[PDB]
């Protein structure tokens, strides 16, 4: 089987004040695209850098997720620290992901430049930052995902099969 990590970084949602809704969207999107068996590993955690680092390491190195996806805490606000956590746990970074994602959200909104989203690699596990709002989560996932199944193949991970009608990956 294959395991994918969904991480929601939200002070409010972690306490139980609001529903996740961003994470629900990431799981819905992954449920489309993918036709192969996969297990979602899903956590909701606060805007605390050390906790994010632990959560990413737990999913990538212990629970063996080939792909981990985060939503939340990617802006200039003092509390938003998801990207810093991502660079700490990652040996190598993937600048292409952030470069493309900001070029797509920038067309509609000029505050794409305020995003600090990034992506990187820990061992055999790929980690990608997504934003908080669900309409943009769908656009970002749809932009970078065609390269992800190939990327996991290059790291001798699971083979990911896709629904050609929802999305088409490159190989």
């Amino acid at each position: 089987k294959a395991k994918i990590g969904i991480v929601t970084v939200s002070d409010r949602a972690s306490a139980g004040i609001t529903a996740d809704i961003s994470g629900k969207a990431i799981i819905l999107a992954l449920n489309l695209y993918l036709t192969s068996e996969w297990e979602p590993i899903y956590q909701v955690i606060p805007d605390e850098q050390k906790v994010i680092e632990t959560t990413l390491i737990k999913m990538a190195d212990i629970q063996d997720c080939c792909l981990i996806v985060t939503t939340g805490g990617t802006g200039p606000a003092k509390r938003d620290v998801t990207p810093e956590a991502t660079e700490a746990v990652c040996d190598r970074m993937m600048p292409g992901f952030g470069e493309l994602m900001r070029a797509e959200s920038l067309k509609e909104v000029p505050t794409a430049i305020l995003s600090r989203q990034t992506a990187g690699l820990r061992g055999d596990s790929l980690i990608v930052n997504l934003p908080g709002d669900p309409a943009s989560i769908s656009d970002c996932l749809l932009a970078v995902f065609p390269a992800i199944p190939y990327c996991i193949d290059l790291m001798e991970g699971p083979y990911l099969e896709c629904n050609e009608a929802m999305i088409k990956p490159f190989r």
Partner: protein, 125 residues
């Protein structure tokens, strides 16, 4: 004894994946906001999409969360210039004795602007 329930949500691009996700999000938050346990309480559900959303039927999203026995119908909303773009609107007819003042309506993403103001406009006439 039927009460309509209105919903509305927006997407950022005309793709099947973003229309299905948004519709499912809107539908589920609509049912939870009024406490609907079973789809059997729905008499029908009606969708409208704006002129710039054409890649998938909302009904296709409805059946992805097992609403096969719910009568579905979709149509095109009036293309008003300057109106909010890429918006899925929902009207669900609900079999209930809930008073009209107590029915909760859902406006998500950019569609929070479409939420009606109780203190707006109105006429002497």
């Amino acid at each position: 004894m039927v009460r309509g329930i209105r919903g509305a949500i927006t997407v950022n691009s005309d793709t099947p994946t973003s229309i299905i996700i948004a519709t499912i999000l809107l539908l589920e938050k609509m049912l939870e906001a009024n406490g609907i346990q079973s789809y059997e309480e729905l008499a029908a559900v009606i969708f409208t999409v704006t002129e710039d959303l054409t890649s998938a039927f909302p009904a296709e999203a409805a059946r992805q969360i097992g609403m096969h026995r719910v009568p579905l119908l979709s149509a095109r909303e009036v293309p008003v210039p300057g109106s909010l773009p890429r918006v899925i609107r929902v009207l669900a007819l609900w079999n209930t004795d809930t008073p009209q003042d107590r029915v909760r309506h859902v406006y998500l993403s950019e569609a929070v602007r479409l939420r009606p103001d109780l203190e707006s406009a109105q006429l002497e006439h």
